[PDB]
Amino acid sequence: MNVLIPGIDGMVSAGTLEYTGCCPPSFADVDECTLATAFVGLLPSGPLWDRPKYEAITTITEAGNCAACWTTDHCPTLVDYAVNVGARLASVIERTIWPAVRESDPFTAVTSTADWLNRFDWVNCFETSCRSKELGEKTPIEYMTDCGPVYVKITYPPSLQQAFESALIKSLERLSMGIIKNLAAINFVIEPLKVRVVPVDTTDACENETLCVVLEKTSDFFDGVNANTCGIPTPVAAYIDRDVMQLPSDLDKYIWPGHMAAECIVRSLLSHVSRFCLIRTEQAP
């Protein structure tokens, strides 16, 4: 007994450590108001700085920007300049350090997903005219013409493409860690794409030709990405209606990018096997 959760090595068992206590305060903590008022502590002390440092009130305007509250008895000094410097500092931290630390990790990147794809050298199998014939007779995005199929480059909506690229990057980062090619590790790798590989056969195979596997959707929603530092990634749908995007009629009714990327990855993983189909099924939400 133990209850095992999937891992980069099959089904390991997991656990939890004790709360240690030390974890530097992170981005989420910094606020213009909590450290605009803090910077007033950097000034000297004396009869010139005592009152002004005591009367330092701070308020929030519309667009953040914790400012000082100039009640109708103010006394212009340097204390308000210190409030200003602290507020700035929080602003430049939130616009300069929080990005470029959020973008250095494939599991938190938001605005640099296409760059991460260029790093991972990800090529699509369905988008090239010289595609392999074993990839199907007509892929969901190819429409038919007298002289063969024709692929159509799709321009997915910005939010959907952001979520799809983020999921692809997570799965490519997990795959680059060198999995063993069983079914549990493969499914764990391609899990962010919300697709699972499930065999068709029941009887011990190993004596029959065609050991095929179907792809099955595990959800109708990519887990998105939050640019903010406090919240929850907003989910987006993972599919496209063909008629809404105004695409040619021969294509499938619903086009799933995650399914095509997962099919590419698994057909590349199990290439050395000599006998293996992959029966794709049209899945309506």
Partner: protein, 50 residues
């Protein structure tokens, strides 16, 4: 696995270069479609001995 096998065969003594199967060596069946090799084959060059 193809790149892995090539990078491993490059470690044999005096193996200078390792190449894939060239273009003039593809193969087609009776129907007229390219056949994909089920094995892993490549060439090697001992450029400073023979």
């Amino acid at each position: 696995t193809v790149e892995w096998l090539k990078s491993k065969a490059a470690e044999w003594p005096c193996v200078t270069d390792v190449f894939d199967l060239g273009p003039n060596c593809c193969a087609v069946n009776a129907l007229g479609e390219v056949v994909c090799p089920n094995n892993f084959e490549f060439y090697v060059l001992f450029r400073d001995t023979f």
